Amino acid sequence: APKAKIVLVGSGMIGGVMATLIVQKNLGDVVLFDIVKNMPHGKALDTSHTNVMAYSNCKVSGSNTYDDLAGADVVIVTAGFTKAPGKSDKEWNRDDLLPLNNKIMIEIGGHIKKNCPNAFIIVVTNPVDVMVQLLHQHSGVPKNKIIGLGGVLDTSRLKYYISQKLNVCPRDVNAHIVGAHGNKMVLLKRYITVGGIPLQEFINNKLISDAELEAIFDRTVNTALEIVNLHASPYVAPAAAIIEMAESYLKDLKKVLICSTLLEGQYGHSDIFGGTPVVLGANGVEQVIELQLNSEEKAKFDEAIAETKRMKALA
Amino acid sequence: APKAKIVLVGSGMIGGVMATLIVQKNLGDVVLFDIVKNMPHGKALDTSHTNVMAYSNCKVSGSNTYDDLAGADVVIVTAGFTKAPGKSDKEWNRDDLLPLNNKIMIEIGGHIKKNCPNAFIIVVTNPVDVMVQLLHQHSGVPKNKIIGLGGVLDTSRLKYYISQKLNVCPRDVNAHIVGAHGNKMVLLKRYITVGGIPLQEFINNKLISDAELEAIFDRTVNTALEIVNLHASPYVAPAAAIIEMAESYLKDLKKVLICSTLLEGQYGHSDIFGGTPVVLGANGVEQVIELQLNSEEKAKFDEAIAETKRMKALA
Amino acid sequence: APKAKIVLVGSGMIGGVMATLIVQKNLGDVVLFDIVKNMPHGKALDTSHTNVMAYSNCKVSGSNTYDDLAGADVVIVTAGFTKAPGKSDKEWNRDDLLPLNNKIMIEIGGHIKKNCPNAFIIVVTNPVDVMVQLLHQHSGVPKNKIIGLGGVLDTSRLKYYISQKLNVCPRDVNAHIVGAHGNKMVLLKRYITVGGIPLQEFINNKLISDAELEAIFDRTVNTALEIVNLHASPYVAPAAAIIEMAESYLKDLKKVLICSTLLEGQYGHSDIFGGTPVVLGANGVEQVIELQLNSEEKAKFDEAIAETKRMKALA
Amino acid sequence: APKAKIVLVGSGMIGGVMATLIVQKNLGDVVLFDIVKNMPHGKALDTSHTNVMAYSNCKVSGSNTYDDLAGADVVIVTAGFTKAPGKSDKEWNRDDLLPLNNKIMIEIGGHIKKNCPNAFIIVVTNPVDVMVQLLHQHSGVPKNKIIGLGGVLDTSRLKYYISQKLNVCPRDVNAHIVGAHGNKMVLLKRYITVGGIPLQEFINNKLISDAELEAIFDRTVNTALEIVNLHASPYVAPAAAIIEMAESYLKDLKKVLICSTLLEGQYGHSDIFGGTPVVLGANGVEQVIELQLNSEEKAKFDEAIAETKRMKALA
Numbered sequence A, B, C, D: 001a002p003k004a005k006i007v008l009v010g011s012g013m014i015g016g017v018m019a020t021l022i023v024q025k026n027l028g029d030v031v032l033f034d035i036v037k038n039m040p041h042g043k044a045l046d047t048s049h050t051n052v053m054a055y056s057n058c059k060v061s062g063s064n065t066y067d068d069l070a071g072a073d074v075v076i077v078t079a080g081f082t083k084a085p086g087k088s089d090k091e092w093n094r095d096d097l098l099p100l101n102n103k104i105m106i107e108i109g110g111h112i113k114k115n116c117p118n119a120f121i122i123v124v125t126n127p128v129d130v131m132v133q134l135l136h137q138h139s140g141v142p143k144n145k146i147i148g149l150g151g152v153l154d155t156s157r158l159k160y161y162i163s164q165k166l167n168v169c170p171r172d173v174n175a176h177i178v179g180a181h182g183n184k185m186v187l188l189k190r191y192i193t194v195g196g197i198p199l200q201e202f203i204n205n206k207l208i209s210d211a212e213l214e215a216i217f218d219r220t221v222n223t224a225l226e227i228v229n230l231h232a233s234p235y236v237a238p239a240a241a242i243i244e245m246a247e248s249y250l251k252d253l254k255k256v257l258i259c260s261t262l263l264e265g266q267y268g269h270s271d272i273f274g275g276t277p278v279v280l281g282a283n284g285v286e287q288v289i290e291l292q293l294n295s296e297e298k299a300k301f302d303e304a305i306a307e308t309k310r311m312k313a314l315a
């Protein structure tokens, strides 16, 4: 009333799962946009039939035309490369995507600025904390209207792994991973809870040990790499994380979700994007929540931001 | 496969909303049992038509026959009185329901023992922490197969009121209320989080004050009384809370939910039921979680348990 | 984005279930408006806590102030009486509500016209086919922006009863009941299908007989009366039916649903509202579907419309 | 209670979407089984994190070990090839998969017979009407416990395409495609309805023409081929169709769904599987519904069955 229009700029692995999930949730009409010919139209057609099974009413169309951005309510950018040519799976590193994806963000930004300057933008393309700011600069959208995917996805892993050990509902585990979405992501041990209870209580009771948690932290940081070596650059959980973010905006849920956002003094940082809990509602980023990090946590935060800053200089 | 059978022992205000919600969620076949003639059959018929609108397939039948408990997978007991004769709305107090409801629990217990000794039992009838133990004693069911409603409902209020001030998704507020479901319920300030973050951070930032929280605590404790004076003994939120509990069992969700359960040393208490976080899954109460309360919190816990113990002696 | 505002004009039995269902489905903010003091505020408070259990974010407020209609996206009118003074349950007849409810519709219409002339209106108050036109005349809203509840509720019953005999998913039974919501409702045997198959195939196969169907027709027509005599004027299924209608509008589902709507030549009738399949989407009544009734079916349709016309003359 | 175990025999494109959808719907624990090393473990890990975003509690594990079939409640077989070596996309034809997939079905059948003879089996591998019977013969399961995917998927397309022209909710279009899932699929014009109304009424009203319908029929038959040429062998809608079938079984929904099933005299055919509406509930295929086809429709049905019979002789 009228349905939201959601344009998926990039119709690859993540784009595909996102279109499926949007139809499942009847969230809005979908455009699968890509530079590749024919492919988005085929995925769109396939996906469109699921309206019947899903009891939904969302158009799904493929596109190779940038002007289809006009009318967009939400734009999700996954366009770009997943690996650098010449690198082995073992050497996969998000940083190496920088020179491959930077020009793509600039190009998409110009099209967003012209066609849908009032759209809410979610950036996924890596290295995401660099790409999101690049897209902000070139699209001209307000700071409350653009975020990057990171924390929802990283914490989904941490939360899940802990829930498996403790035999509780995965959603009942809460956790914060901040700073940047990459190898220096900051896993905040102090901010983990289980059913709202400090994880330390479960550690005291020998239900999960400090050593076990350390292994889970390492597993979390290395999850993307693990999946890349077993199969491919992850796409199912990324897609679900993105749609959770988009849905909070579309339905004014006001969920607290960790995303990459413009910092203006939080954690002592300005002029850069970094991962922190934000509240997402109808007005976009409605609140930026600054964790009251201790000195040691801040030092880790600084190390994460330093990586983003280093690559921004290279971009 | 085969559908669960859920018997609602008591088909009054809460029974009615529970049957509606069960059909909405397609959770299982429903029996609305009551001592009142005709009424449960009418509510059952009305509710049964919603299968069409809900895309569900749950039978809803009315009953005046205790043997319909046979085959029950889940039994929810709301049977009893909501107010004591002669009391004004202003003087409403759960304790006064004790002499009115005790015999009803004993009678229902015998029927459960005979007909569905393997059913999972949820007790709602007040005073609930007393009634749940009474029903445990008379039904003979295992300690992991019977709980009382309290904490999910009490915290729903605390969580909601805080979410309204902070402008966040209500589910993103987590909170613990323990001990007993009554005027001595223990509201644990230290165990409140918002998006997994300690509420104290929001207090430090002047987003919500200590005084505001105190008023919200008082409002929470007095919510039932407030609604009784405006309208009636609450039933919509109680129903939703109960169904959240029942659903966790039925679908093996392993949610952490605060319920009245048999204590065997937790908090220094045994031989009595009290409200504490538990994990509910296919095996019933799969874990009893003992909060590592400080000395002052424990003193409040003791005061709550003392009320249950006092009335148990009167029952 | 921004959330829809749904004003429930009338906060009685149907109003209450509607508020519960709106929160379950996170459809929009809710105002429970009534002339009765205190009651709507109590129901609103009770219902509001279910946001936690439902993972929703809908405000629920009570009101005694007509100006709260301002900003309404959807207005659902249930205000009025359910029985006439002096009538026994056995003599319950919707027609007798005419003199009791007519003035209420006129009053509400004026408030709608002043405060929310662009709102989509659903009329429930009986006799509904008369009341809906009355409200149309006094609210001044466009013909595509006001409908009356009838067919979704009447067919829910017919569909359900058949599904019980045939042991199929209730939603897989489709059926049409047209003309008016009252004792002359037209049950169109020819337009019944099961899994899209003509019911006649199942009759040919002796899975359900003509006599059985006749009994189901009588049961359907008399369902309200049956429930009134067992318990109360039905409210759970009415509520669900209404919310299915409101949801189709809000989410632009374009569902085909039988509702009371302004006829402009369909079935040979103009200047009156009658029950017929319509398509409900973001533009309100997007299509009025005229069944190609045979001569005998039309005669039944005419008899139904004649009752509406008779009472319109009495109103 | 306890959760269902769903084993996906084949973890390729359809397997992946099915695992995603199972977690979204919290339907049961999932095993992604494949002969390919590492791949299923990576997809399983990726998918498992979505439990957090989905509020679900389903294990997702990868496997290369046939014995993981033990304990299966539902087995979905997609194992096999999607195209024949040497064929161009333009020449794609399901029949050419026969010699590639027959041995795979025999092998899987033996493992099912040994490990989970009581599981409900859904066969997807093409040519499906041949493969499903092959799997029936080798698994030894009862006729009511094995079906093949076809009609739900084929009609999803027909229903959707019509809904796009008529501007109605796609689920409100009902349609039957029977016989076999291949180029001779039988599209039954007479059994199409829109909101339960015969499509002929909409044709009479010039809302959709006979010529338009003919083009939609051709488009439906050729949809797989169209998508193969634009992108790949379809997987999103197939997955959704399969999960709709599996869910009806798991939750005892009793939905009427067109699937390939053992014929024992229906349509004049025995000793072969063919597509027809069936009712799926807790007892598996609870009813086989025989459409009362006219002579001309039957001739088309016979042509479809003849293709299955021809390839069965070649298998």
Ligand SMILES: NC(=O)c1ccc[n+]([C@@H]2O[C@H](COP(=O)([O-])OP(=O)(O)OC[C@H]3O[C@@H](n4cnc5c(N)ncnc54)[C@H](O)[C@@H]3O)[C@@H](O)[C@H]2O)c1
Binding pocket: A009, A010, A011, A012, A013, A014, A015, A033, A034, A035, A036, A078, A079, A080, A081, A082, A097, A101, A104, A107, A123, A124, A125, A126, A128, A148, A149, A150, A153, A181, A233, A234, A235, A238
């Ligand atoms: N932020 C995160 O947490 C996170 C998580 C996973 C993935 N990633 C990143 O997301 C990106 C997408 O991953 P994927 O798995 O979907 O990759 P993919 O290769 O399957 O899809 C990317 C698509 O982008 C398309 N593309 C290239 N240029 C384009 C342009 N100008 N406009 C539109 N489309 C264009 C490609 O043709 C391709 O189809 C990668 O950069 C990956 O590193 C980020």
Ligand SMILES: NC(=O)c1ccc[n+]([C@@H]2O[C@H](COP(=O)([O-])OP(=O)(O)OC[C@H]3O[C@@H](n4cnc5c(N)ncnc54)[C@H](O)[C@@H]3O)[C@@H](O)[C@H]2O)c1
Binding pocket: B009, B010, B011, B012, B013, B014, B015, B033, B034, B035, B036, B078, B079, B080, B081, B082, B097, B101, B104, B107, B123, B124, B125, B126, B128, B148, B149, B150, B153, B181, B233, B234, B235, B238
């Ligand atoms: N634990 C909690 O958090 C909580 C919350 C709200 C309500 N309550 C309590 O729940 C109970 C029910 O509340 P309600 O609003 O549904 O009240 P209600 O009066 O609407 O319904 C109670 C029903 O119990 C029936 N009944 C009496 N004896 C019975 C028997 N032997 N077997 C079956 N039914 C019998 C009555 O006829 C009545 O229909 C009350 O005791 C109330 O105090 C507890």
Ligand SMILES: NC(=O)c1ccc[n+]([C@@H]2O[C@H](COP(=O)([O-])OP(=O)(O)OC[C@H]3O[C@@H](n4cnc5c(N)ncnc54)[C@H](O)[C@@H]3O)[C@@H](O)[C@H]2O)c1
Binding pocket: C009, C010, C011, C012, C013, C014, C015, C033, C034, C035, C036, C078, C079, C080, C081, C082, C097, C101, C104, C107, C123, C124, C125, C126, C128, C148, C149, C150, C153, C181, C233, C234, C235, C238
């Ligand atoms: N169309 C249908 O299929 C259908 C189905 C069921 C009910 N009904 C009708 O719906 C109406 C409501 O039924 P219910 O069960 O909710 O009855 P109810 O008596 O529980 O509630 C009606 C409410 O309207 C209120 N009211 C009276 N005047 C008002 C005004 N000016 N503004 C706001 N509120 C006002 C009353 O105080 C009461 O709370 C009845 O007329 C009934 O016959 C119609």
Ligand SMILES: NC(=O)c1ccc[n+]([C@@H]2O[C@H](COP(=O)([O-])OP(=O)(O)OC[C@H]3O[C@@H](n4cnc5c(N)ncnc54)[C@H](O)[C@@H]3O)[C@@H](O)[C@H]2O)c1
Binding pocket: D009, D010, D011, D012, D013, D014, D015, D033, D034, D035, D036, D078, D079, D080, D081, D082, D097, D101, D104, D107, D123, D124, D125, D126, D128, D148, D149, D150, D153, D181, D233, D234, D235, D238
């Ligand atoms: N019935 C239908 O309506 C319908 C619809 C679409 C697809 N299909 C068929 O479904 C099948 C699967 O399609 P897809 O898109 O998922 O193909 P896919 O190639 O992506 O996946 C098939 C998987 O089967 C695996 N496999 C091979 N032998 C195996 C074995 N012995 N055990 C377990 N796994 C084995 C392969 O390694 C591969 O991962 C194809 O035959 C296709 O024609 C049928």
Ligand SMILES: O=C(O)c1nonc1O
Binding pocket: A094, A126, A153, A181, A224, A233, A234, A235, A238
């Ligand atoms: O973390 C991930 O899943 C990821 N996968 O590819 N790029 C990423 O950032």
Ligand SMILES: O=C(O)c1nonc1O
Binding pocket: B094, B126, B153, B181, B224, B233, B234, B235, B238
């Ligand atoms: O807390 C409540 O809602 C309540 N209402 O009636 N009894 C109770 O315990």
Ligand SMILES: O=C(O)c1nonc1O
Binding pocket: C094, C126, C153, C181, C224, C233, C234, C235, C238
């Ligand atoms: O049909 C009904 O349910 C009904 N109940 O009260 N009035 C009505 O129209």
Ligand SMILES: O=C(O)c1nonc1O
Binding pocket: D094, D126, D153, D181, D224, D233, D234, D235, D238
């Ligand atoms: O119909 C289909 O989608 C299909 N795709 O690949 N094989 C099939 O049968």
